[PDB]
Amino acid sequence: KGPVAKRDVLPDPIYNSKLVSRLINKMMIDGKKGKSQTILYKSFDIIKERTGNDAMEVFEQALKNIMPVLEVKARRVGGANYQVPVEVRPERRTTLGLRWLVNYARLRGEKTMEERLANEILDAANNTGAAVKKREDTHKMAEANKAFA
Amino acid sequence: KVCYFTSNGITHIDYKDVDLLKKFVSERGKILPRRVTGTNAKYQRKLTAAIKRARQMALLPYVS
Amino acid sequence: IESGIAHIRSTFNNTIVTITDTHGNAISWSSAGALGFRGSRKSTPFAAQMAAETAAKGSIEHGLKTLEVTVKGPGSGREAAIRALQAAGLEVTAIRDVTPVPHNGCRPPKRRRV
RNA sequence: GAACUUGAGUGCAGAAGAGGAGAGUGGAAUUCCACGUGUAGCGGUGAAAUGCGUAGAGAUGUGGAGGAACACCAGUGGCGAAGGCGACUCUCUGGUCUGUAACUGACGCUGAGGAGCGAAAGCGUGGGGAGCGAACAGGAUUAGAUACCCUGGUAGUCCACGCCGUAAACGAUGAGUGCUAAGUGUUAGGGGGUUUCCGCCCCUUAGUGCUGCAGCUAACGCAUUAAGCACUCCGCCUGGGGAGUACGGUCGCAAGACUGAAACUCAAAGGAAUUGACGGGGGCCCGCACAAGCGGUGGAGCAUGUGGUUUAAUUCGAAGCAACGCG
Known part of the structure; x- marks a missing residue:
């Protein structure tokens, strides 16, 4: 079998980043990059307006807050249901x-x-935010189950 | 291995030889088996009999 | 005091560590269940590490610094508890691996699946 | 009737052994007890709970009591007829093996019936009770759970004597003897060729393992420790069930043991081995199989097909995957 890898497209016409086009490919409903690009640039223009910064740095700072260090996978031996931190x-x-970001954004409601x-x-x-609930709760699950590694 | 008692020609092991028995007894206090000390069957039997008698006179330990 | 002996007893449920004084006078004690783990997590060597940490915290009041650790009971948390006494500010000098060995003695309770 | 010494045994000399019986002693540990440390748990499980615990537990130090088995030696090692026998010491005592040459000179083997031994459970009497533990109680799992799991715990396990006299009491292989390739460990001896030795090699016993030739066998396998080739003696089998039953008898405090059918019933029961399939057996591998994701179905409305039911007919065909927007 073995691991296979994938690709993604480098620029964005405003905000030339890889990961912003990675978010463009994300939140695409039913094969519509046009709606997600419009939503994305209007959102980053709001982030540039409402807070007087470039929205790249706010966006990476938000990423740094959300990106979880420790998933906790499963390892079932017997009837035990142990979770193993990864x-x-x-x-x-x-x-x-x-x-x-994408799921709890569209789950918020505005x-x-x-x-x-x-x-x-x-x-x-x-x-303090909605995806960071998931960040905190995954780190609490890894903190409690740290005995297995 | 090689037997000790065949080498020095010595027969009945004579419980009084506390230093020789102290050589055969392991670090914790146990008797080392025949594949460690290299003796015969007969000499290992007389060794273990010797060690048990010398234990009952406190010439050898039980637990250390 | 400055010197004491650390009795670790790690059995298949619990790893109880009592840091006592040389003619047997317990300065502080903490178990794997005392830390809060109630379930099967009592058996994990992390709880033995935590129990050695709490026993080390409790021992350094009136105090003691250089331990002498006696491993008792057949378990798993002996190595983490020896290491965690070091990393919590104490010194572990001798390691007495003394689980109570009967020679022949009493007969055990029956094997389980029968 | 007379001789002989190989078979058998005595003699002398060693050697090894948990061979047995009686008495005494030891060291861990388990439990219990008292005191010091000290505080909130302990215990247990797949998950928990009953239990134990602030009235001070679990841990820990010292001391004491009591019972039972004797780690390491320990080994397809030893001994015994078998059961069996593992600390040590003494008292008494059984057998074996080795070297012969001193003796006897066939004195030998098997053995129905008889006599004895005879694991464990059980029984009687008196003790004993630490652990374990039927029965029994509570909690769990579970549809049920008189079970497995957990917490408790009676008889018993222990000792003395008496009874039972049974086991997959097994090497599933009666005892004796002789003959019939090897290799190799090992247990206890003996002897040789150099070395006083250490040690290597060789040879020979008696015991004990494995692999193996002829031979045997249905095959698996056994093969000098035979399931080979022979002789002696004993026990046992003559289809499965009924049935180790019933009756009678002997023994037993009892439980039961031994001896042991018939009516009736079936055309099989069975062994070893092959090919498959299966496993809540092991290994390796692979597939949108799982995981990692994205979108759904199941909820609503309708389209469509199918089951039931109403029918005059609701035409017939498909029915788990592999029928059901199918012909």
């Missing part, structure tokens, strides 16, 4: 951060996902 390799750190994703980035920047 040091996450940083690709999965970035992709779990992007899933949690008068566009422009505003929802923008306010979720603004909350994950000033660390």
Whole structure:
């Protein structure tokens, strides 16, 4: 079998980043990159406006707050259901951060996902936020089950 | 291995030889088996009899 | 005091560590269940590490610094508890691996699946 | 009737052995007890709970009591007819093996019936009770759980004597003897070729393992420790069930043991080995199989197909995957 790897497209016409196009490919509903690019640039323009910074640094700061160090996988021996803590390799750190941004942004509920994703980035920047519930709860699950490694 | 008692020609092991028995007894206090000390069957039997009698006169330990 | 002996008793459920005084006077004690783990997590060597940490914290009041650790009971948490006494500010000099060995003695209770 | 010494045994000399019986002693540990340390748990499980615990437990130090088995030696090692026998010492005592040459000179072997020994459980009497532990109680799992799991715990396990006299009491292989390739460990001897030795080699016993030739066998395998080739003696089998039953008898405090059918019933029961399939057996591998994800179905409305039911007919065909927007 063995591991297979994938690719992704380098630029964005505003905000020339790899990972911002990685978020563009994320949150795509039904094969519509156009709607996700419009939502994304209107959200990052809100993040540039409402806080007087470039939204790249706010976005990476939010990522740094969300990216979990420790997943806790499963290892069932007998009838035990043990969970085993896993040091996450940083690709999965970035992709779990992007899933949690996208999922809890559209799960929040405001008068566009422009505003929802923008306010979720603004909350994950000033660390208290909705995806950071998942960050904290995964680190608490790894902290309690640290006896197995 | 090689036997000790065949080498020095010595017969009945004579419990009074506390230093020789102290050589055969292990570090914790146990008797070392025949594949460690290299003796015969007969000489290992007389060795273990010797060590048990010398234990009952406190010439040899039980536990250390 | 400055010197004492650390009795670790790690059995298949619990790893109880009591740091006592040389003619047997317990300065402080903590178990794997005393730390809070109630389930099967009592058996993990992390709880033995935590129990050695708490016993080390309790021992350094009126105090003591250089231990002499006696491993008792057939378990798992002996190595982590010896290492965790070192990393909690104490010194572990001798290691007496003394589990109570009967020669022949009493007969054990029956094997389990029968 | 007379001789002989090989078979058998005595004599002398060693050697090894948990061979047995009686008495005495030891060291761990388990439990219990008292005191010091000290505080909130302990214990246990797949998960928990009953239990133990602030009235001070679990841990720990010292001391004491009591019972039972004797770690390491320990080994397809030893001994015994078998059961069996593992600390040590003494008292008495059984057998074996080795070297012969001193003796006897066939004195030998087997053995129905008889006599004895005879694991464990059980029985009687008196003690004993630490651990374990039927029965029994509580908690769990569970549809049920008179079970497995956990916490307790009676008889018993222990000792003295008496009874029972049974086991997969097994090497599933009666005892004796002779003959019939080897290799190799090992247990206890003996002897040789150099070395006083150490040690190596060789030879020979008696015991004990494995691999192996002829031979045997249905095959697996055994093979000088035979399941080979022979002789002696004994026990036992003559299809499965009924049935080790019933009756009678002997023994037994009892439980039961031994001896032991028939009516009836079946055309099989069975052994060893092959090919498959299966395993809540092991290994290795692979598939959107699992995981990692994305979107759904199951909820609502309708389309469509199928089961039931109503029918005059609701035409017939498909029915787990592999029928059900199928012909």
